[PDB]
Structures are given as C-alpha cells and as structure tokens.
Amino acid sequence: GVNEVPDYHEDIHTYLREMEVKCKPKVGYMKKQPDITNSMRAILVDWLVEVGEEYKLQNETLHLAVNYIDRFLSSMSVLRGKLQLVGTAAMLLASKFEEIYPPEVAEFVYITDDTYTKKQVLRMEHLVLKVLAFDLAAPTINQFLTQYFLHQQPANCKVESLAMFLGELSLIDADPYLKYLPSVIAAAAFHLALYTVTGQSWPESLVQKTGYTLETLKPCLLDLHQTYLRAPQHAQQSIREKYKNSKYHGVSLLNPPETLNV
Amino acid sequence: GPGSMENFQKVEKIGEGTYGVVYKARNKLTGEVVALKKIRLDTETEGVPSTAIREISLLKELNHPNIVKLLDVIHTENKLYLVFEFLHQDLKKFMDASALTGIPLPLIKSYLFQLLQGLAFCHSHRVLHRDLKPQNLLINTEGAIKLADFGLARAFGVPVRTYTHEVVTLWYRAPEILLGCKYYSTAVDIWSLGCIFAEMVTRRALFPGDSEIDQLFRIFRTLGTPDEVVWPGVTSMPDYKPSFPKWARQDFSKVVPPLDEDGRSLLSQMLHYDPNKRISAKAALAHPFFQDVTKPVP
Ligand SMILES: O=c1cc(Br)ccn1CCO
Ligand SMILES: O=c1cc(Br)ccn1CCO
C-alpha cells in the first residue's frame, strides 16, 4: 500500500542511485590522512555503534553519521586526538536529521568522557555543516536494503535482520568497503542473508529493478563473505553484540555459509 | 556560499516564524528581490536547530518551479541566513483580501494543478512536506503558486518508518494521524491538498476543529464515520474507540455545492479515508478536472 509508496518507489530508487554517486567519499583518502588509519576509523565506528544502542538510535542514524564522517575526512585532515570530535558532531547532526527525539548536545558531550567541551562539539557541528555544504540527505545501505526487502516471497525477518547486520559490519572497514556504493553493498548483503537463511539467491525482480546481477555483485560479495567469516575474530565486536539481541532475531549467532557456489 | 550580507538591502519585515524574522531584501548587485529568513544560533544552546538542518538539506535538492527556491545560505558564527526567492503573497491572504466574492474556477484549477506538480516532485524525491496549508503556499504576480516552509518536512525511506506524530496543522491533518497510526506516508500531504482544494472553492476551512477529537468528529460528520468496509483496519487503530458516533456519509454535492462533477470526483479521491486508496499527486495530474487547465495570473 501507500507505506511502500507504489507510485514513487522507482523514482525514489533512481534518485537515490544518482545521489549515492554525489555523496560518495574519496576511495583513497586514508592514505592522504597523515595521522589517522583505517584501524582508528574502525574504532570510531564501533564506538558510534555502541552510542547508537545506548541511546536507542535508529540504524539509519548510524549509517548517516558514517557517511558524514567519511565525506568530511575526504577533504579535511584530522589529528588522531580530534577524530572522536568529528564523529561526535557527525552523530549529533545525523540524530537531528533522522530522529524524532535526538539526544541533547550535553549527552553527546557526556559520552566523550569530557574529552571535549560543549563549545567544541557545537563548533565542529558548524564545521561539518560547512564542509558538507548542508548536503545531509545521503543515501544509505539501509535505504536500499528496505526496498530490496519488498522482493522477498515471503518476508523473512531473519533474512532482513541478517542483511542489516552484514551491511553494518561493512561500515567498520574502509578497506575494502569505501570502494563500493551503498546500493551494491546492500545488494551483496541481501543475497548473502537470503542465501545463508533460505538457500535462495538474488531474485530476478531485483535484477530488473537495479540492473545488478550476481556477476556485477561478485567482488563485493566475496569481500562481504570474508568479513562475515572472520567477524568473531575482528578486533571490533560491538555490532555482533547488538545483533545477539532479540530485536534483531539474534542473527549474529547464525552460522556463515562456508561457500557461496558462485 | 556565493554571497554575503553586504550585498543585500533590507526593505521591510514580511514575516516571523518561531526561528526568527523574515525580511524582503534586494540584491544591490543583481537587482534580485529575495526573502531573507534569519535563524539565530548565538541564542541557541542546542546548536543548529533540526528544523533548519532539514529545511536546508531538503530544499537544496528540490529544484522545481512550484517549490520556493533556496538561493543561498549565509553561515556566520552567530547567525544563519537562508536566502529565498521572493513571492509577494500567500494563498491565505489572497483568499481573505481579494477573493471576497470568490476565486474564479480557472485560477482554482491552475493553482491546484501547480500544487500537485510541486508535491509530486517532493514525493518523487522521498520528501514529505507535513504542513500543507494556505499560509505555506506562496503566489507571485505571474500566477505561479509554490510550496513553501519545509521546516516540518522529512526525508522518508521505502517503506516508511514511524515518524513524528501530531504533524500537520490540525485543520489539515489526515485521519490516519488523528487515529494515532504507527505509519503514515505520502497520503497525508494529499489530504492537506484536498482540504485546501475545498477551501479555495468556499474560502473557508473544510474541517476547523478545536481539538484532535473535534477534528475527527467534523471529518466523520462530513465523510461518514469510517468502518472496516470503507477503511480496512480502522477499528484496530490505536486511538480508534468503538464508542465513536456513527455518522452517515453525506452526499458529496452537499459538502462543496458549487463544485462540478469532475471537481467532486477529484476531491473525493483526495479525501478517501483509506490512505491506500487515496489518490497520488502523480495520478491526480491526469484527472479530467484539469482537462482545460491554463496558468492565469492573480
Ligand atoms: O582516540 C580515539 C578515540 C576514538 Br572513539 C576513535 C579513534 N581514536 C584515535 C586513536 O585510537
Ligand atoms: O518565509 C518565507 C517567505 C518567502 Br516570500 C519566501 C520564503 N520564506 C521561507 C519559507 O519558505
């Protein structure tokens, strides 16, 4: 019905496809950052995952924040001591954009363990807004996922949750996910989830919608499949902890497939 | 961005929201008349307001002839200036001051047709307006009308999630919001436009309630109290009560007597109880009511 916006879903998908390209971070920016590394970024994102669950924020908010951060670090060089300040302001902006009830600024100061002042958080807020030129309505993995989900016959909540989980895992690791668009990671994540839970494969209807095939998804899929296998070993564990929860059907306890068969 | 306050000459104050004041101003270099919305941050303890973050980010993306244009944003440390295209009037002032003996049917038709184009463009770009009312529709001297005030607007996902409740000025608010529904969608904007359509014909609000429950009752007394047949799920809705009086649907020619058959049809499809059956902006553009549409000036 109207909740799935029959008359606009295609227009919207097409628009999101054009926007994800505009909102894309620079693939190679971490090499151009003198003082920070993929590893430090992973620590930040893992922390923002914990912040999101402590304040019971939407997953969309988490995804937006990571988008803001990566775009910011694409043109602005940041000392390791200030990385958290960027992340905090990102999360604040994303909260004000997507949340009904965003946490107050003071709560954002609080979670930084008084590493930063409210003035520093607010001034960084302004800086991020300047650097992004207010361009905050960014397509996320989630925005594509929810559309792809409409193609399950029938809906399977384990599939949905597992896809969300895999997509979130991809936020942690700039290498190699910075090089894939949200629409493509979402596709890879949906197929892996679907295959893992039901044995089924990326449906023809989504091939029609997206123009993507298992052929075109294969690179990303291979990376996502590795990320899923080694997730119990990753240094960052907050997403796995969150997906043990019943809200998400405890999908982090599901076992990864050992092979994909193409 | 590409601009500084030095180049504007303030002319008069044209408005005032809860964010601050709007002035009509003039670009001293180009000649352009603009509206400056000032948003004060220095006074702000919570940094840049979410209302402004949404308005700017969403309006940056919406270039359409029936959506007011955000021309620029001047971003000081103490103040934020939104530069907008200037339009002389809103539809509310127009209906009150010059439409004393009515808006002619050609102009009603032109206005509704433009509003649907604007709204269709919003929905196609995953934006809900959530405050369509005559005060927020701006008219120029050329006969254009444009959706304005995107401070209550929202970027949606497909399918939609639960968003803020009690959105939309009460008289323009859809039953599905009034009944506390978990989810609402593009249909809430169509309802508002339906109310506005009627309001352009009569020059008076269609459902001027003084509380949530009075709004519902005035709607029910006009369209009939909905049941499972007209609106599957209604009786399950969180703020549906079985004790609701059961009013008969009045024939639609009595709701807006001056309206013709095509008009009545279009109106009925905008005010359908069931958000799933309610007509979309995109579909409504094809309705026979518009068969002879032109763009007359006020
Ligand atoms: O100091 C911090 C804090 C967070 Br949270 C993330 C990254 N860094 C850089 C050094 O690890
Ligand atoms: O308040 C005004 C007035 C004019 Br005229 C144009 C834009 N705005 C801001 C809301 O759109």
Coordinates of C-alpha atoms and ligand atoms in Angstrom, one line a residue:
Chain A
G1 CA 0.0 0.0 0.0
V2 CA 0.9 3.7 0.4
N3 CA 3.5 2.8 3.1
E4 CA 5.6 1.2 0.3
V5 CA 4.7 4.2 -2.0
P6 CA 3.7 2.3 -5.1
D7 CA 3.6 5.4 -7.2
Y8 CA 7.1 6.8 -6.3
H9 CA 9.3 3.8 -5.3
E10 CA 11.0 3.7 -8.8
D11 CA 11.5 7.5 -9.0
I12 CA 12.9 7.3 -5.5
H13 CA 15.3 4.4 -6.2
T14 CA 16.5 6.1 -9.4
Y15 CA 17.1 9.4 -7.4
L16 CA 18.9 7.5 -4.6
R17 CA 21.2 5.9 -7.3
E18 CA 22.2 9.4 -8.6
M19 CA 22.6 10.8 -5.1
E20 CA 24.8 7.9 -3.8
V21 CA 27.3 8.8 -6.5
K22 CA 27.3 12.5 -5.4
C23 CA 27.6 11.6 -1.7
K24 CA 30.4 9.1 -2.3
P25 CA 33.6 9.6 -0.2
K26 CA 37.0 9.5 -1.8
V27 CA 38.1 5.9 -2.0
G28 CA 41.7 6.7 -1.3
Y29 CA 41.6 9.3 1.5
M30 CA 43.0 7.3 4.3
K31 CA 46.4 7.2 2.6
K32 CA 46.2 11.0 2.3
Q33 CA 45.5 11.3 6.1
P34 CA 48.9 11.8 7.9
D35 CA 47.8 10.9 11.4
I36 CA 44.9 8.5 11.2
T37 CA 44.4 5.0 9.8
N38 CA 41.6 2.5 8.8
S39 CA 42.2 1.0 12.2
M40 CA 41.4 4.2 14.1
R41 CA 38.3 4.7 11.9
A42 CA 37.1 1.2 12.8
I43 CA 37.5 2.0 16.5
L44 CA 35.4 5.2 15.9
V45 CA 32.6 3.5 14.0
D46 CA 32.5 0.6 16.6
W47 CA 32.1 3.3 19.3
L48 CA 29.3 5.0 17.3
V49 CA 27.6 1.6 17.2
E50 CA 27.7 1.5 21.0
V51 CA 26.5 5.1 21.2
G52 CA 23.5 4.3 19.0
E53 CA 22.4 1.3 21.2
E54 CA 22.9 3.2 24.5
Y55 CA 20.6 6.0 23.2
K56 CA 18.4 3.5 21.2
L57 CA 19.0 5.5 18.0
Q58 CA 17.8 4.3 14.6
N59 CA 20.2 2.3 12.5
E60 CA 19.7 4.9 9.7
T61 CA 21.3 7.5 12.0
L62 CA 24.3 5.3 12.4
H63 CA 24.7 4.9 8.6
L64 CA 24.2 8.7 8.0
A65 CA 26.9 9.5 10.6
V66 CA 29.5 7.3 8.9
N67 CA 28.6 8.9 5.6
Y68 CA 29.2 12.4 7.1
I69 CA 32.5 11.3 8.7
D70 CA 33.9 9.7 5.5
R71 CA 33.0 12.7 3.4
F72 CA 34.5 15.0 6.0
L73 CA 37.8 13.1 6.2
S74 CA 37.8 13.1 2.3
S75 CA 38.7 16.8 2.3
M76 CA 39.8 17.6 5.9
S77 CA 42.9 16.4 7.5
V78 CA 42.4 15.4 11.2
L79 CA 44.8 14.6 14.1
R80 CA 44.0 11.4 16.0
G81 CA 43.1 13.4 19.1
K82 CA 40.3 15.1 17.2
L83 CA 38.8 12.1 15.3
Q84 CA 36.3 11.5 18.1
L85 CA 35.2 15.1 18.0
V86 CA 34.3 14.8 14.2
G87 CA 32.5 11.5 14.9
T88 CA 30.5 13.1 17.8
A89 CA 29.4 16.0 15.7
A90 CA 28.5 13.7 12.9
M91 CA 26.3 11.6 15.2
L92 CA 24.6 14.8 16.5
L93 CA 23.9 16.1 13.0
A94 CA 22.6 12.6 11.9
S95 CA 20.4 12.5 15.1
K96 CA 18.9 15.9 14.4
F97 CA 18.2 14.8 10.8
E98 CA 16.6 11.4 11.3
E99 CA 15.5 11.1 15.0
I100 CA 12.1 12.0 16.3
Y101 CA 13.8 12.6 19.7
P102 CA 17.6 13.3 19.2
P103 CA 19.8 13.2 22.3
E104 CA 20.7 16.7 23.6
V105 CA 24.1 18.2 22.9
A106 CA 25.1 17.7 26.6
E107 CA 24.5 13.9 26.2
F108 CA 26.9 13.9 23.2
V109 CA 29.5 15.7 25.4
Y110 CA 28.8 13.1 28.2
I111 CA 29.6 10.1 26.0
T112 CA 33.0 11.5 25.1
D113 CA 34.0 11.3 28.8
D114 CA 34.6 15.0 28.9
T115 CA 37.4 14.7 26.3
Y116 CA 35.7 17.7 24.6
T117 CA 33.6 20.7 25.7
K118 CA 30.1 21.5 24.5
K119 CA 31.6 24.5 22.7
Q120 CA 34.0 22.2 20.8
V121 CA 31.1 19.9 19.8
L122 CA 29.0 22.8 18.6
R123 CA 31.8 24.5 16.7
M124 CA 32.6 21.1 15.0
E125 CA 28.9 20.8 14.2
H126 CA 29.2 24.1 12.2
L127 CA 32.4 22.9 10.6
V128 CA 30.9 19.7 9.3
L129 CA 27.9 21.6 8.0
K130 CA 30.2 23.9 6.1
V131 CA 32.4 21.1 4.7
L132 CA 29.3 19.1 3.6
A133 CA 27.5 22.3 2.4
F134 CA 24.4 21.1 4.3
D135 CA 24.2 18.1 1.9
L136 CA 22.8 15.7 4.6
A137 CA 20.1 13.7 2.9
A138 CA 22.6 11.0 1.9
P139 CA 21.5 7.5 0.5
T140 CA 22.5 4.8 3.0
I141 CA 22.8 1.0 2.8
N142 CA 19.6 0.8 4.8
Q143 CA 17.6 2.9 2.3
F144 CA 18.4 0.4 -0.4
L145 CA 18.0 -2.7 1.8
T146 CA 14.5 -1.8 2.9
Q147 CA 13.5 -1.6 -0.8
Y148 CA 15.2 -4.8 -1.7
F149 CA 13.3 -6.5 1.2
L150 CA 10.0 -5.8 -0.6
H151 CA 11.1 -8.5 -3.1
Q152 CA 11.2 -11.4 -0.7
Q153 CA 8.5 -14.0 -1.2
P154 CA 7.5 -14.2 1.6
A155 CA 9.0 -11.7 4.0
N156 CA 11.5 -13.4 6.4
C157 CA 12.6 -11.4 9.4
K158 CA 15.8 -13.5 9.8
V159 CA 16.8 -12.5 6.3
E160 CA 16.0 -8.8 6.9
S161 CA 18.0 -8.7 10.2
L162 CA 20.9 -10.7 8.8
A163 CA 21.1 -8.3 5.8
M164 CA 21.1 -5.3 8.2
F165 CA 23.9 -6.9 10.3
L166 CA 26.2 -7.6 7.3
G167 CA 25.6 -4.0 6.0
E168 CA 26.6 -2.7 9.4
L169 CA 29.7 -4.8 9.5
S170 CA 30.8 -3.1 6.2
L171 CA 30.7 0.4 7.9
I172 CA 33.7 -0.7 10.1
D173 CA 36.2 -1.5 7.4
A174 CA 37.1 1.4 5.0
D175 CA 39.2 -1.2 3.2
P176 CA 37.5 -2.6 1.3
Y177 CA 34.0 -1.1 1.5
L178 CA 34.9 2.5 0.7
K179 CA 35.1 1.4 -2.9
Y180 CA 31.5 0.1 -3.1
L181 CA 28.3 2.2 -3.3
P182 CA 25.6 1.7 -0.7
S183 CA 23.3 0.2 -3.3
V184 CA 25.9 -2.5 -4.1
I185 CA 26.9 -3.4 -0.5
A186 CA 23.1 -3.6 0.2
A187 CA 22.7 -6.0 -2.7
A188 CA 25.6 -8.2 -1.7
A189 CA 24.3 -8.2 1.9
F190 CA 20.8 -9.1 0.8
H191 CA 21.9 -12.0 -1.3
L192 CA 24.2 -13.3 1.4
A193 CA 21.5 -13.0 4.0
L194 CA 19.0 -14.7 1.7
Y195 CA 21.4 -17.5 0.8
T196 CA 22.5 -18.1 4.4
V197 CA 19.0 -18.3 5.8
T198 CA 16.9 -19.9 2.9
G199 CA 19.5 -21.0 0.3
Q200 CA 17.9 -18.7 -2.2
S201 CA 19.6 -16.3 -4.5
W202 CA 19.4 -12.6 -5.5
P203 CA 16.0 -12.5 -7.3
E204 CA 15.4 -11.7 -11.0
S205 CA 13.0 -8.9 -9.9
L206 CA 15.9 -7.1 -8.2
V207 CA 18.0 -7.7 -11.3
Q208 CA 15.1 -5.8 -13.1
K209 CA 15.0 -3.1 -10.5
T210 CA 18.7 -2.5 -10.0
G211 CA 20.4 -3.8 -13.2
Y212 CA 22.7 -5.7 -10.9
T213 CA 23.5 -9.4 -11.3
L214 CA 25.5 -11.9 -9.2
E215 CA 28.1 -11.2 -11.9
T216 CA 28.2 -7.5 -11.0
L217 CA 27.9 -8.1 -7.2
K218 CA 30.6 -10.8 -7.1
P219 CA 33.6 -8.7 -6.0
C220 CA 31.7 -7.1 -3.1
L221 CA 30.1 -10.4 -2.2
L222 CA 33.5 -12.1 -1.9
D223 CA 34.6 -9.4 0.5
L224 CA 31.4 -9.5 2.5
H225 CA 31.6 -13.2 2.7
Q226 CA 35.1 -13.0 4.2
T227 CA 34.0 -10.2 6.6
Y228 CA 31.2 -12.5 7.8
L229 CA 33.5 -15.5 8.2
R230 CA 36.1 -13.6 10.3
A231 CA 33.7 -11.4 12.2
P232 CA 34.1 -13.4 15.5
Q233 CA 37.9 -12.6 15.2
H234 CA 37.6 -8.9 14.2
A235 CA 39.0 -6.5 16.9
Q236 CA 35.7 -4.6 16.8
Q237 CA 32.8 -6.6 18.2
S238 CA 30.0 -4.1 19.1
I239 CA 27.9 -5.0 16.0
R240 CA 28.0 -8.7 16.8
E241 CA 26.9 -7.9 20.4
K242 CA 24.0 -5.8 19.2
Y243 CA 22.8 -8.4 16.8
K244 CA 22.8 -11.1 19.5
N245 CA 19.8 -9.1 20.8
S246 CA 16.2 -10.4 20.1
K247 CA 15.2 -7.1 18.5
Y248 CA 17.4 -8.4 15.6
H249 CA 16.4 -12.0 15.9
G250 CA 19.9 -12.9 17.3
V251 CA 21.1 -13.2 13.7
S252 CA 24.8 -12.7 14.8
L253 CA 24.5 -16.3 16.3
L254 CA 23.6 -17.7 12.9
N255 CA 26.5 -19.6 11.2
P256 CA 28.0 -18.1 8.0
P257 CA 27.9 -20.4 4.9
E258 CA 31.4 -22.0 4.2
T259 CA 31.0 -21.4 0.4
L260 CA 28.8 -19.4 -2.0
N261 CA 28.8 -21.6 -5.1
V262 CA 29.4 -18.5 -7.4
Chain B
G1 CA 28.2 30.2 -0.1
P2 CA 28.2 32.5 -3.1
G3 CA 27.0 35.5 -1.1
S4 CA 27.5 38.0 1.9
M5 CA 25.1 40.3 3.8
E6 CA 26.9 43.4 2.5
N7 CA 25.2 42.9 -0.9
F8 CA 21.6 42.9 0.5
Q9 CA 19.5 46.0 1.3
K10 CA 16.6 45.1 3.7
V11 CA 13.3 46.6 2.6
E12 CA 10.7 45.5 5.2
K13 CA 9.8 42.7 7.6
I14 CA 7.4 40.3 5.8
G15 CA 7.0 37.5 8.3
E16 CA 8.1 35.8 11.5
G17 CA 8.4 32.1 12.4
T18 CA 9.5 30.6 15.8
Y19 CA 13.0 30.7 14.4
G20 CA 13.0 34.4 13.8
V21 CA 12.1 37.1 11.3
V22 CA 11.8 37.1 7.5
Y23 CA 12.6 40.3 5.6
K24 CA 12.1 41.2 1.9
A25 CA 15.5 42.3 0.7
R26 CA 17.2 43.4 -2.6
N27 CA 20.5 42.3 -4.1
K28 CA 22.3 45.5 -4.7
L29 CA 24.4 44.0 -7.4
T30 CA 21.9 42.0 -9.5
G31 CA 18.6 43.7 -8.6
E32 CA 17.1 40.4 -7.3
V33 CA 14.4 40.7 -4.7
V34 CA 14.7 37.9 -2.1
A35 CA 13.3 36.9 1.2
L36 CA 15.9 36.6 4.0
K37 CA 15.0 34.1 6.8
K38 CA 17.2 34.7 9.8
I39 CA 17.9 31.7 12.1
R40 CA 19.7 32.8 15.3
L41 CA 22.3 30.3 16.7
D42 CA 24.1 32.6 19.2
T43 CA 20.8 32.4 21.2
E44 CA 20.9 28.6 20.5
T45 CA 22.2 26.3 23.2
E46 CA 21.5 23.1 21.1
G47 CA 23.5 24.3 18.1
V48 CA 21.9 24.5 14.7
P49 CA 18.2 23.6 15.1
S50 CA 17.0 20.3 13.4
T51 CA 14.2 22.2 11.8
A52 CA 16.8 24.3 9.9
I53 CA 19.0 21.3 9.1
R54 CA 16.0 19.6 7.5
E55 CA 14.8 22.7 5.7
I56 CA 18.2 23.5 4.1
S57 CA 19.3 19.9 3.3
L58 CA 15.9 19.0 1.8
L59 CA 15.4 22.3 -0.1
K60 CA 18.9 22.2 -1.6
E61 CA 17.7 19.1 -3.6
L62 CA 14.3 20.3 -4.6
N63 CA 14.6 22.4 -7.7
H64 CA 11.1 22.7 -9.2
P65 CA 9.0 25.7 -10.4
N66 CA 6.3 25.0 -7.8
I67 CA 8.7 24.7 -4.8
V68 CA 10.2 28.0 -3.4
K69 CA 13.9 28.1 -4.2
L70 CA 16.7 28.2 -1.6
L71 CA 19.1 30.5 -3.4
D72 CA 21.8 30.6 -0.7
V73 CA 22.8 30.1 2.9
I74 CA 25.0 32.7 4.7
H75 CA 26.7 30.9 7.5
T76 CA 28.2 33.2 10.2
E77 CA 29.3 32.0 13.7
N78 CA 26.4 33.8 15.4
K79 CA 23.7 33.7 12.6
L80 CA 22.3 31.7 9.8
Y81 CA 20.7 33.4 6.7
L82 CA 18.5 31.5 4.3
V83 CA 18.1 33.4 1.0
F84 CA 14.9 32.5 -0.7
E85 CA 13.2 33.6 -3.9
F86 CA 10.7 36.3 -3.1
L87 CA 6.9 35.9 -3.8
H88 CA 4.5 38.8 -2.9
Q89 CA 1.7 36.9 -1.2
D90 CA 0.4 33.6 0.4
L91 CA -2.8 31.8 -0.6
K92 CA -4.4 32.6 2.8
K93 CA -4.0 36.4 2.4
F94 CA -5.2 36.1 -1.2
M95 CA -8.4 34.3 -0.2
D96 CA -9.1 36.8 2.6
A97 CA -8.4 40.0 0.9
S98 CA -9.1 39.7 -2.8
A99 CA -11.2 36.6 -3.1
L100 CA -14.1 38.3 -1.3
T101 CA -16.6 37.2 -3.9
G102 CA -14.6 34.1 -4.9
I103 CA -11.6 32.6 -6.7
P104 CA -12.6 32.1 -10.4
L105 CA -12.7 28.4 -11.4
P106 CA -9.8 28.8 -13.9
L107 CA -7.5 30.1 -11.2
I108 CA -8.5 27.4 -8.6
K109 CA -7.8 24.8 -11.3
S110 CA -4.4 26.3 -12.2
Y111 CA -3.4 26.6 -8.5
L112 CA -4.4 23.0 -7.6
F113 CA -2.6 21.7 -10.8
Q114 CA 0.6 23.5 -9.8
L115 CA 0.4 22.4 -6.2
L116 CA 0.1 18.7 -7.4
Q117 CA 3.2 19.2 -9.6
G118 CA 5.1 20.5 -6.6
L119 CA 4.0 17.8 -4.3
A120 CA 4.6 15.0 -6.9
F121 CA 8.1 16.3 -7.2
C122 CA 8.6 16.1 -3.4
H123 CA 7.3 12.6 -3.2
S124 CA 9.4 11.5 -6.1
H125 CA 12.4 12.8 -4.1
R126 CA 11.5 11.0 -0.9
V127 CA 10.3 14.2 0.9
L128 CA 7.0 14.6 2.9
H129 CA 6.0 18.1 3.5
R130 CA 3.8 17.6 6.5
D131 CA 2.5 21.2 6.8
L132 CA 0.5 21.9 3.6
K133 CA -1.9 24.8 4.4
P134 CA -2.8 28.1 2.6
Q135 CA -0.3 30.2 4.7
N136 CA 2.6 28.0 3.4
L137 CA 1.6 28.3 -0.3
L138 CA 3.2 31.4 -2.0
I139 CA 1.8 33.1 -5.1
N140 CA 3.6 35.6 -7.3
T141 CA 2.4 38.2 -9.8
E142 CA 2.8 35.8 -12.7
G143 CA 0.2 33.4 -11.5
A144 CA 2.6 30.8 -10.1
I145 CA 2.0 29.1 -6.7
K146 CA 4.7 27.3 -4.8
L147 CA 5.1 25.0 -1.8
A148 CA 6.9 26.8 1.0
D149 CA 8.1 26.3 4.6
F150 CA 9.9 22.9 4.7
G151 CA 10.7 23.2 8.5
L152 CA 8.3 20.4 9.3
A153 CA 9.4 18.2 6.3
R154 CA 11.1 14.8 6.4
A155 CA 13.2 12.6 4.2
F156 CA 11.4 9.2 4.1
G157 CA 12.6 5.6 3.5
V158 CA 10.7 3.0 1.4
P159 CA 8.7 1.6 3.2
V160 CA 8.3 4.4 5.7
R161 CA 9.3 4.1 9.4
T162 CA 7.4 5.6 12.3
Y163 CA 7.9 9.4 12.3
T164 CA 6.8 12.3 14.5
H165 CA 3.1 12.3 15.4
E166 CA 0.7 15.2 15.6
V167 CA 2.4 16.6 12.5
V168 CA 0.4 18.9 10.2
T169 CA -1.6 22.0 11.4
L170 CA -4.8 20.4 12.9
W171 CA -7.3 21.6 10.3
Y172 CA -5.2 20.0 7.5
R173 CA -4.3 16.8 9.4
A174 CA -5.3 13.4 8.0
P175 CA -7.5 10.9 9.8
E176 CA -4.6 8.4 10.0
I177 CA -2.6 10.8 12.1
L178 CA -5.6 11.7 14.3
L179 CA -6.1 7.9 14.9
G180 CA -2.5 7.5 16.1
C181 CA -1.5 5.1 13.3
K182 CA 2.1 3.7 13.6
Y183 CA 2.8 4.6 9.9
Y184 CA 1.9 7.5 7.7
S185 CA 3.0 8.2 4.1
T186 CA 2.6 10.4 1.1
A187 CA -1.2 10.3 1.5
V188 CA -1.0 12.8 4.5
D189 CA 0.1 15.5 2.0
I190 CA -2.7 14.7 -0.4
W191 CA -5.3 15.0 2.4
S192 CA -4.0 18.5 3.2
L193 CA -4.3 19.5 -0.5
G194 CA -7.8 18.1 -0.5
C195 CA -8.7 20.3 2.4
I196 CA -7.0 23.3 0.6
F197 CA -8.9 22.5 -2.7
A198 CA -12.2 22.7 -0.9
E199 CA -11.0 25.8 1.0
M200 CA -10.2 27.6 -2.3
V201 CA -13.8 27.0 -3.5
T202 CA -15.6 28.1 -0.4
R203 CA -12.9 30.5 1.1
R204 CA -13.4 28.7 4.5
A205 CA -11.6 25.8 6.2
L206 CA -13.3 22.4 5.5
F207 CA -12.7 20.9 9.0
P208 CA -11.9 23.7 11.5
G209 CA -11.8 21.6 14.7
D210 CA -10.6 22.9 18.1
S211 CA -9.1 19.6 19.3
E212 CA -7.9 16.3 18.0
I213 CA -11.3 14.6 18.8
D214 CA -13.3 17.5 17.4
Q215 CA -11.3 17.4 14.1
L216 CA -12.1 13.7 13.8
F217 CA -15.8 14.3 14.6
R218 CA -16.1 17.1 12.0
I219 CA -14.5 14.8 9.4
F220 CA -16.8 11.9 10.3
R221 CA -19.8 14.2 10.1
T222 CA -18.8 15.2 6.6
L223 CA -17.5 11.9 5.1
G224 CA -19.3 9.5 7.4
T225 CA -17.8 7.6 10.3
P226 CA -15.4 5.0 8.7
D227 CA -15.8 1.3 9.3
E228 CA -14.0 -1.9 8.1
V229 CA -15.7 -1.8 4.7
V230 CA -14.6 1.7 3.7
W231 CA -11.3 1.5 5.6
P232 CA -9.9 -2.0 6.5
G233 CA -8.0 -1.8 9.8
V234 CA -9.6 1.5 11.0
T235 CA -11.3 -0.2 14.1
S236 CA -7.9 -1.6 15.2
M237 CA -6.1 1.7 15.1
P238 CA -4.6 2.9 18.4
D239 CA -6.9 5.8 19.1
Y240 CA -10.0 4.4 17.4
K241 CA -12.7 4.0 20.0
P242 CA -15.8 1.8 19.4
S243 CA -17.9 4.5 21.2
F244 CA -17.3 6.8 18.2
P245 CA -20.7 8.1 17.0
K246 CA -21.6 6.5 13.7
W247 CA -22.5 9.4 11.3
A248 CA -23.8 8.8 7.8
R249 CA -21.7 9.8 4.8
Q250 CA -23.3 12.9 3.4
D251 CA -23.6 13.1 -0.4
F252 CA -20.5 14.9 -1.7
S253 CA -22.5 17.6 -3.7
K254 CA -23.6 18.9 -0.3
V255 CA -20.0 19.2 1.0
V256 CA -19.0 21.7 -1.7
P257 CA -22.2 22.7 -3.6
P258 CA -20.6 25.0 -6.2
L259 CA -18.3 22.2 -7.4
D260 CA -18.9 20.4 -10.7
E261 CA -18.9 16.6 -11.2
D262 CA -15.2 16.4 -12.1
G263 CA -14.2 18.6 -9.2
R264 CA -16.3 16.5 -6.8
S265 CA -14.6 13.3 -8.1
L266 CA -11.1 14.7 -7.6
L267 CA -12.0 16.0 -4.2
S268 CA -13.5 12.6 -3.1
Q269 CA -10.3 10.8 -4.2
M270 CA -8.1 13.2 -2.2
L271 CA -10.3 12.8 1.0
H272 CA -10.6 9.0 0.8
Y273 CA -10.4 7.5 4.3
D274 CA -8.1 4.6 3.3
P275 CA -4.6 6.1 2.7
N276 CA -4.0 3.2 0.3
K277 CA -7.0 4.2 -2.0
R278 CA -6.3 7.9 -1.6
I279 CA -5.2 9.4 -5.0
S280 CA -1.5 10.2 -5.5
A281 CA -0.2 13.6 -6.7
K282 CA 1.1 11.9 -9.8
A283 CA -2.2 10.2 -10.7
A284 CA -4.2 13.3 -9.9
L285 CA -2.5 15.4 -12.5
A286 CA -4.3 13.3 -15.1
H287 CA -7.8 13.8 -13.6
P288 CA -10.4 15.1 -16.0
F289 CA -10.9 18.2 -13.7
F290 CA -7.7 19.6 -15.3
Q291 CA -8.7 19.0 -19.0
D292 CA -8.8 22.7 -19.8
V293 CA -6.1 24.0 -17.3
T294 CA -4.3 27.2 -18.0
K295 CA -2.0 29.4 -15.9
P296 CA -3.9 32.7 -15.3
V297 CA -2.3 35.4 -13.1
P298 CA -3.9 36.8 -9.9
Ligands
LIG1 O1 41.3 8.4 20.2 C1 40.4 7.8 19.6 C2 39.1 7.7 20.0 C3 38.1 7.1 19.2 BR1 36.3 6.8 19.9 C4 38.4 6.7 17.9 C5 39.7 6.8 17.4 N1 40.7 7.4 18.2 C6 42.1 7.6 17.7 C7 43.1 6.8 18.5 O2 42.7 5.5 18.6
LIG2 O1 9.0 32.9 4.8 C1 9.3 33.0 3.6 C2 8.7 34.0 2.8 C3 9.1 34.0 1.4 BR1 8.3 35.4 0.4 C4 9.9 33.0 0.9 C5 10.4 32.0 1.7 N1 10.1 32.0 3.0 C6 10.6 30.9 3.9 C7 9.7 29.8 3.9 O2 9.7 29.2 2.6

